Amino acid sequence: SHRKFERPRHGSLGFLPRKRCKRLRGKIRSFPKDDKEKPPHFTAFMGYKAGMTHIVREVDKPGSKLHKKEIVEACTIIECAPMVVVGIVGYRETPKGLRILSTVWANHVSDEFRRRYYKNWYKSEKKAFTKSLNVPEATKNCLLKRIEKYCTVLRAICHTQPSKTPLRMKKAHIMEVQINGGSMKEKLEFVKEMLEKNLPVSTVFNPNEMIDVISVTKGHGTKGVVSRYGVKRLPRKTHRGLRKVACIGAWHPARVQFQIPRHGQKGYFHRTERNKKIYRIGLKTDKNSASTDADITEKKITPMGGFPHYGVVNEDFLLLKGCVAGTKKRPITLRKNIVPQVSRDALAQVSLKFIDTSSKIGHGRFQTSEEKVKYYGPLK
Amino acid sequence: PVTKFITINLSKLTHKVCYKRKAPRAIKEIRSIAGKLMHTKDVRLDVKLNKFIWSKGVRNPPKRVRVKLERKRNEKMYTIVEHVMVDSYKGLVNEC
RNA sequence: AAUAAUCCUAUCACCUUUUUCGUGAGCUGAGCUGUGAGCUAGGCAAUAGUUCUUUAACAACAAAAAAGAGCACAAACUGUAGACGACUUUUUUGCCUCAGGGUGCUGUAAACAUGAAAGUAAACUUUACGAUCUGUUGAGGCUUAUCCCUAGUGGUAAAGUGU
RNA sequence: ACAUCUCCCUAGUGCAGAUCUUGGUGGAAGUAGCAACUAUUCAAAUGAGAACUUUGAAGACUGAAGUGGAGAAGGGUUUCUU
RNA sequence: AUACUGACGUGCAAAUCGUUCAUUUCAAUCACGUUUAGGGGCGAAAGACUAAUCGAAAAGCCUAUUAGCUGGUUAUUUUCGA
RNA sequence: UGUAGGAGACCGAUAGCAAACAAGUACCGUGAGGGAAAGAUGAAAUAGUACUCAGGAAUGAGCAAUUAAAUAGUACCUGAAA
C-alpha cells in the first residue's frame, strides 16, 4: 500500500555512484562552444586553493531591502602561478566523437613537466623527451599545416608551475585547454605565438567575470547512511543500533532496488560549482594587494600568520566570491561559462570597501604584525 | 661507530595514544626513533630514562627529552640510548 | 533503361634464330643489362598401366647466414588519502630532525620584598606568628601532532624484487 | 585358500534413499571467534627459543564487606622437595 | 529481583552480566540435623513444588503394549494388465 | 540355573552373549539404576630397526642395515570408498 504521508527522497539519484575520483586534477566535462566572431582565446586555468577570507562590499541591488547599504561576504583566495603552454593538440570530428590527429610540442620543456611522467625521478637516468629532443622544423610545419587542414578543434597542452609554490609536490599538472574563437588558422597562429610564454590569470580572465569551478571534494572515507544520505535517525528503542539502516524495501524486485541509501564512500567526488564571480585579480608585485579605495594603506593579501597550511601569497592570485570544492592546498580548475552569463550580477562591477587580512588561526584581530606590536608595546 | 646527543620532542610522538598507553607507547616510539637514527634493530634502553619519563605517571609525557645514543659493535651491531640530566631544553640543538 | 542475362579474366611448357614497345638497375639526357609484353623460325618435353584430395590457401614458430640500433615495483618520507589495499607526495634547488622566529592560546610561574594584610603574643616604643593581596610580572607555561616561516642544528638507511 | 552352469536342496539372500542404524568425512572456514574484572615498562638471568618464566628496578592496582588470614561441607595427595 | 521489554541471546550463564529498584527487627534471614513419598506428600492457591524431570517424579518390568494413521519397504528381461 | 562333556547345512568382529579383550569393567546417574568403545606384524623378533651424518631436540637422510618381503617398523595383515 501507498505511504500515509508523503516526504521527498533522501539525496540525489543522479550522483550515484558516490565513489572516489580517479584523478586529483579536476576534469572539464565540456568546453565553451562556437563563436567565430570572437577572437581566439584560452578557456580554462588551474590554480591552487589557499584559503578563505571575508570582504566588505558596497551594494547597488535595485529595489532590494538592503539596496544601497554595504554587505559583508565570505570569499575564497586561489594562488595562481602562471601556466606554461608546451604542446598543441589537433582534434577532428568523427561520428565516433572527437579524435586526436597529432600533437605538436615546444622546442624545450621543463624539468617539472618531465617529473610528472617519472615515478622515480630521484632513482632514474631521466631519458624522456631525448629522441624527441628535436626533429626538422619542416616536420613541425607539416604537422601544423596538416592540423589546420583537417582538425576542427584546437586544444593547447599547458602545465602548472609548482616550483613557484610552497607545496611538497614538485610534479607539474599537465592539462589540455580548448581555444575558442575565430578560424582554425587564426587560432593556430594565436597558440604558436603564445606557446613558450607564461600565462597569468589576468591574461586569461577579467575581474567581475562569472566563472565555473571544477574540483574534487574533501575526503572522509567510507561512511554510514545517516552521514552519506541524511535519513531520519532510528527511534530510541531498537534491537540493534541507531545509525543502522532503515528497511531496504519491497519483495518485488526480488533484489535490492538500487535507489535505496547505503553505507560507502563520502567525499572525494568530482563536482562542478557554477557562476562564481571574480572579485579581484591580484598582482604579485603589488604591496597594496589587500587594500581598497576606503583603506588606501600598504598591505599585502596574505593573512596575519598567512593562510592555514599554505602561509604566504607570493604569486598572482584570484579573489573569488563564495565557496569552492576540495581541501585547502588543492588544485582548482577555472573554466569560462559554456555560454556567457547574462544577468544583473554578471554585468555588475564590484566595489570593495575592505578585504580582511586578520588571523585565521585563533581570533587574532590584527591586520598586521606591526599593529599587534603597536598594541602590546615594549618586550623583554 | 658514533656517539650522538639529540633532543626528542616526546609531545608530538605521544599525541595519538590514550592515557593508559601514553608512556609505554612513547617508550616504544623512543626505541623506534633511536633505531631509525642509528640504523640498529637492537636498541638497548635506559631504565633511568624510563623512570624519569614515568615519574609523573603514564598519563603525561615530558614535552622534550635529551637522549644520548652510542652505536656499538659488540654482523652484530647495536645501540645504547640513555638519559641526559639538565634543567630545561631551551635552544638545545642536536650534536655529535 | 535484363539492371553481373555484363565486363574483366585465364590455358601460346622448352631452349634456341629473328624484329618492336613499356618499366627498373649499374656507368659517363643517352647507351647497355635485367624485368614485363609481343612478333619470327626450328625440332624438342610430358608418359606410373581405371577413380577414391587435384598437398596447390592463409598465418605462426626453430635452426642457419646476411643486414639494421633502461624502467617499474619496493624502501623510507608524505597525508590534499585511507578499514585494508588503493590514492597524493617527496627522497640532497629536497626531506626528516630538533631549535629559533612568526601565528597564537592560557592569564600573570617559581623566587624574593626588614612590601600591604582581619587580628594574634612578648619584650623594655622593639621582636615574633598570619588565610590573603600587591609589586618584581602581559609574567610563566604551551603552540604540529593535520599551523606558518627559516639553505639555522644534526641527520638522510635497505639495496631487495619484477620486467 | 578358491569354484562347480553337473544336479538338487537350504537360507539372517540382492539397497540410494527410512529427520534409516553405525562409523568415518567434507563444503560452510583459516572464517565465527579467543571483548566481565582501569596497565604495564626497562634491564638482567635462565634456556634451543622468552609480551605473558625467574630476579631486580620502576609504574600501577587489591584497599580490611580485601584476589589478606582462618576454619565447616565437599574434594583427596590436589600438598612438599627433586 | 521493579524497570530499562538494558547488555547477552552458536552466552561468562540450558536464565548470566550491568544499571535501576524492593528488603533490612521480625509473620525476619542463615546453618545443620530432622519429619511428611507418588493419584501420595506438602502448597500465604499459582495446579505451586516434590534433585536441568511434573495437570501426576525417577527406576525397572508386563511390552516387541496398541495405532483404521505418518514415514520407509532392496538385481534384471519378457508377457497379460486395472 | 551351577558344573562337566559332546554338537552343528549357526555367527565370523557394526555379527554372535552386553562382553573373542584387564567387561558386567571403564564411564554416567543423588540413588534404585543405566552401561560402553575395545582382536590379528613376521616362519622366526633367542630376526623388534645396529651404524653414520645433519639436527637444541623431535626427527630426517644415508655409500650404512634385519628379513623372502619394511609405501611388512608394534597407532605394524589386506588396506576399498568418501
Automatic annotation (TrEMBL), chain A:
Transmembrane segments: none
GO CC terms in record: cytosolic large ribosomal subunit
GO biological process, one term: translation
Entries under InterPro entries matching the protein: L3_arc_euk (IPR045077), Ribosomal_L3_dom_3_arc_sf (IPR044892), Ribosomal_uL3 (IPR000597), Ribosomal_uL3_CS (IPR019926), Transl_B-barrel_sf (IPR009000)
Binding site for Mg(2+) 1: 360
Family: Belongs to the universal ribosomal protein uL3 family.
Protein name: 60S ribosomal protein L3
Taxonomic classification: Eukaryota, Sar, Alveolata, Apicomplexa, Aconoidasida
From TrEMBL, chain B:
Keyword hit for Ribosomal protein: yes
Membership in a protein family: Belongs to the eukaryotic ribosomal protein eL31 family.
Keywords: Ribonucleoprotein, Ribosomal protein
PROSITE patterns per record: RIBOSOMAL_L31E
GO CC aspect terms: cytosolic large ribosomal subunit
GO molecular function list: structural constituent of ribosome
Protein's UniProt name: 60S ribosomal protein L31
Lineage: Eukaryota, Sar, Alveolata, Apicomplexa, Aconoidasida
Superkingdom, natural source: Eukaryota
PANTHER family hit by this protein: 60S RIBOSOMAL PROTEIN L31
Alphabetical GO biological process terms: cytoplasmic translation; translation
